[PDB]
Every structure is written in structure tokens, then in C-alpha cells.
């Protein structure tokens, strides 16, 4: 389920601790350290000037890389207050050092409900917000039109409709939309929706 949400991010590279929240009242951080030998590490965080807490790490194969992660508690995560994080080798040498506003690292589901249908305009796209995610009145979407060719139309706060009228005829077209949080919010592009296809007119 969530295994493929994290799978998106891991191609952000090993030099940064990849963290994200699913609904702004939770948080998960991981890094990939291909096995070729576990070792030992420490995960510390500080919330404001509260005494530093320790998150218990967990280990799991991925295939043949190893994924070390941990999960924060809801009382720490539910505030838009900076939160420090730290991963330290047992020798003391620091691996990662990071400050996040949890509201800035939200990763959404893919939007569902994508429909394509001709308009006297010459096509109209509609789709639904990512399910089981609140604050839908603030999502940022993006469509992708492909024929080979690709084009991305940016759609801003709370719109679930596209009015593309500048097309070709007698060509196959493919459409997909992604979603992310938007000026008191931020995060990462969701995976793409399931695509929809439409054979254009003459």
C-alpha cells in the first residue's frame, strides 16, 4: 500500500533523509543503505525546546537494498512548528541533519475519477481529489497530454476541470493528473492518476 508511496521518493538520492506526512498528523523518515551489513545508528529529534526524544529504527529488505526508517508520534506532528531530526552512526559521525515543517512534506494519493469527453468548443477533462485526504479545497493539480509528444498544463488551487481546446485531429491522446498541497502548505507531487484515452475528431 504505502510501500509504493515511499518508492516514489527514494530516487531523491541518498544525501537527504526522505520524510513525508500522509495527513499532517503523522510522519515517517527513511534512507536506503544497500546491504552488501546492518550496522547500528541512532535517530534523535527535537520538537522546539522540549527534551530530545529518540525514535526506534526498523530494518527491512526491499530488493537488494536495505531500508532503515522510523515513525513519529501524532502529538509531536500535529503542529506547524519546526522539528529537528538527526541520524547518527554509533561512532558519533553524523549521517543526516535536517529541519522540517511537517506541513511542508505532505505526499498525497493519486487523484481518481478522470474523465475525457468532447465539448462547440473542439475537449473537457474532469477528475476527483485524492480520496481519504482532507483539505481538498487547496490541492494543486497538473495534467499531462501525450500523442511522440508530451505537454503539462498546471491547474491551481481547487480546480477539477480542464478546458483544452488547442488540439490535433485524427491522433490518439493520453491524459493523467497528479496532485500536491499548495502558500501555507507544501509537499511532493503525487503519483499520476490512471490515464484516460481519446481519439480526436476530423
Amino acid at each position, epitope marked *: 500500500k504505502f510501500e509504493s508511496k515511499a518508492a516514489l521518493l527514494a530516487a531523491r538520492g541518498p544525501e537527504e533523509l526522505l520524510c513525508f506526512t500522509e495527513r499532517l498528523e503523522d510522519l515517517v523518515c527513511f534512507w536506503e543503505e544497500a546491504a552488501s551489513g546492518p550496522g547500528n545508528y541512532s535517530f*534523535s529529534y*527535537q520538537l522546539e*525546546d522540549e*527534551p*530530545w526524544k529518540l525514535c526506534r529504527l526498523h530494518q527491512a529488505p526491499t530488493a537488494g537494498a536495505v531500508r532503515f526508517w522510523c515513525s513519529l508520534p501524532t502529538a509531536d506532528t500535529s503542529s506547524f512548528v519546526p522539528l529537528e531530526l538527526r541520524v*547518527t552512526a554509533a561512532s*558519533g559521525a553524523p549521517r543526516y*541533519h535536517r*529541519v522540517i*515543517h511537517i506541513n511542508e512534506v505532505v505526499l498525497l494519493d493519486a487523484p481518481v475519477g478522470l474523465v475525457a469527453r468532447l465539448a462547440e468548443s473542439g475537449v473537457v477533462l474532469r477528475w476527483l481529489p485524492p480520496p481519504e485526504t482532507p483539505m481538498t479545497s487547496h490541492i494543486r493539480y497538473e495534467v499531462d497530454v501525450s500523442a511522440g509528444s508530451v505537454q503539462r498544463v498546471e491547474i491551481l488551487e481547487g480546480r477539477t476541470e480542464c478546458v483544452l481546446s488547442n488540439l490535433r485531429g485524427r491522433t490518439r491522446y493520453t491524459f493523467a493528473v497528479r496532485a500536491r498541497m499548495a502558500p501555507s502548505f507544501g509537499g511532493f507531487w503525487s503519483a499520476w492518476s490512471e490515464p484516460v484515452s481519446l481519439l480526436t475528431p476530423s
Partner: antibody
Amino acid sequence: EVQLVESGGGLVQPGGSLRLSCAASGFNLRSYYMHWVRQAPGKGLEWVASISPYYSYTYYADSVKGRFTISADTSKNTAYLQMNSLRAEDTAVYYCARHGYGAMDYWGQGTLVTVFN
Amino acid sequence: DIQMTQSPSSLSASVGDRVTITCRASQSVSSAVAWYQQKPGKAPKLLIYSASSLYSGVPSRFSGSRSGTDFTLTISSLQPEDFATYYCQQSSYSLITFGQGTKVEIKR
């Protein structure tokens, strides 16, 4: 309530040694990062060393490596900075601060180390 | 290493003026950057943290912003108590470095 209180500065010849103390009340020192920062008279701020929570990992500025040692004693809720092989350029007012909000939120009043010839 | 080049090293403004101090990270480093005010004979006092967040009790005329590698602190309407020296601080993994300081003096 929260308070840091330093002691131990003074006058020392070149090459001699001094041990500074940082007594902390109103929070448990074990659960925090602690730093020593020094200020030469008429000059700016220079970080000196840090110590970590629960593991007491120590990190030093390149200038004081080998000669200075940061340490803590949890039973007395005090941090120490033992300075060895003191040079004239070590002369400064020495602060200890407490990690918080991603910076140092609580600083002591500072103690003056004078290396004299 | 990390360098922090603070500019200007001094400025003169009148009471009620808008002032901006700027701090340039020599390089690629985390936005764990804070601002301290220091007055003669006293320890530094934390003003801003996480490059933009006001420390509890600090007046609203203080503001933090970033753009690329440039971190700026702005005081929107100078009051007599604000004339002091200001430092920026950056923390990286273990090294902590400070700007060379900026002294704010009164125009008379």
C-alpha cells in the same frame, strides 16, 4: 526557572590548564545538546564544542581539537570544558548554551579566561 | 568548511527606520540559521530560528527571510532598544559558524 551558571575562569599562563563548569537547573542536562561558545574581547562569537544527549558524542571546532574536552556529569546536572595547552589567543569570555528551536535558546552569563604572559 | 559572510558590518539609522541585515552562506547548507541580538556586557539573545520563525516573546518588527544562499534579517521600525550587534548562525552536521557581526548605530 531555566538557568545556566558558569564558573572556573581566571588567569592562566601559556600552556597551563583550566576547567570550566556549567551548572544547569530547571531542565535535565542529559536530554539536551550543550554548546560552549567563546568571545574574544572586542570580537565576535566562535563556536567551541558540543555534546549530544544520552550518547555524549563530542564535536569540537578545528581550533580547539586535542586540547579541549567537553564532558558532562548527569548526577550533578553539570557540563564541563577542560582546556589544556592554553594559548594567548584563547583569551575570551566563555559561554555555555542549551540547544532549542534549532539554535541556542538559553545562555549562561559567561566566565572570562585570561591567558597572560 | 562553511563560511558566513555578514554584511554590512555596521550601519547608522534613525529611530523608526527600516533596516535589513544580510548573511551569505559560502555554500550549500541547511536552513538551520538563527539570529541573535547582543548588547554590551550581555549574552546573545535568540531572536529568529529556522531562518524565519519569531522566537517566543520577540516583537513583530523582527522578520526573517531567505532567498537562495542569502539569509536576511529585517527590523521594520527601529526602536531605541534595537540598537545593538546582530549575528547570524548556521549549523550543518557538527560545525556551527557565525557571521562576523553587524553593529546598528543611531543616526543623530
